[PDB]
Amino acid sequence: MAEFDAVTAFADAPAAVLSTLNADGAPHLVPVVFAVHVPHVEGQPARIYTAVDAKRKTTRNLRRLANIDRDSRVSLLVDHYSDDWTQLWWVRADGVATTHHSGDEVATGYALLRAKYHQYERVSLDGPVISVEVSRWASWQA
């Protein structure tokens, strides 16, 4: 951990990269917007929420190629890049992802995303929510 508040810096950033494992164990990367929920009690883990944008579809037809549901281990990285290399920093969060189609976690993820991103005033939230339980934080600065 570098000497800044890594969780706040990660939380305040608008975009992160999400890494999941393919079926054959190879890495896979997608960008995400997200919102961090900081623990209520000391010792409890942070959780990170991201929603998947969904078009209206049949309940059991369309399929997703990549797997979280098969392997749940994920990592998320926020980088602050600048052409001025003195201003570089990053924060990584490693954890376990769970996909939710209804229930508390969907409601919580939509609410937190709406609170963070003004854009969701005009972009609907209709898809499933991935919740990541963070087990390790790392950070670095220039």
Ligand X SMILES: C[C@H](OP(=O)(O)OC[C@@H](O)[C@@H](O)[C@@H](O)Cn1c2nc(=O)[nH]c(=O)c-2cc2ccc(O)cc21)C(=O)N[C@@H](CCC(=O)N[C@@H](CCC(=O)O)C(=O)O)C(=O)O
Residues forming contacts to a copy of itself in the complex (CB under 8 A) are 14-15, 17, 19-21, 25-31, 55-56, 73-77, 79, 81, 83, 85, 88, 90, 92, 94, 119, 123, 140-142
Q: Does 58 bind ligand X (CB under 6 A)?
A: yes
- Pick what 76 binds: a copy of itself, ligand X, none; C-beta below 5 to 8 Å, kind-dependent: a copy of itself
Cα(10)–Cα(48) distance, integer angstroms: 10
Decide whether 49 or 90 has the Cβ nearer to a copy of itself. Answer: 90
DSSP per position, 11-75: HH-S-EEEEEE-TTS-EEEEEE--EEE--SSTTPPPEEEEE----S--TT----SSBSSS--EEE
List the one residue from 9, 13, 32, 125 that touches ligand X (CB under 6 A). 32
List the one residue from 4, 5, 15, 69 that touches ligand X (CB under 6 A). 15
Report in angstroms the alpha-carbon separations of 44 from 41, 47, 91, 92.
6, 10, 19, 18
Kindly indicate which of the ranges 59-67, 70-78, 103-111, 116-124 contains the residues binding ligand X, using the contact rule CB under 6 A.
59-67
HSE-CB at 14 with a 13 A cutoff on CA atoms is 5
Strand, helix or coil for residue 97: strand
For residue 115, the surrounding DSSP H or E stretch is helix 104-116
Cα(23)–Cα(66) distance, integer angstroms: 7
Site residues for ligand X, 91-130, by CB under 6 A, read none
- Pick what 60 binds: ligand X, a copy of itself, none; C-beta below 5 to 8 Å, kind-dependent: none
Q: Does 40 bind ligand X (CB under 6 A)?
A: no
Residues that bind ligand X (CB under 6 A): 15, 28, 30-33, 50-53, 55-59, 62-64, 79, 81, 88-90, 138, 140
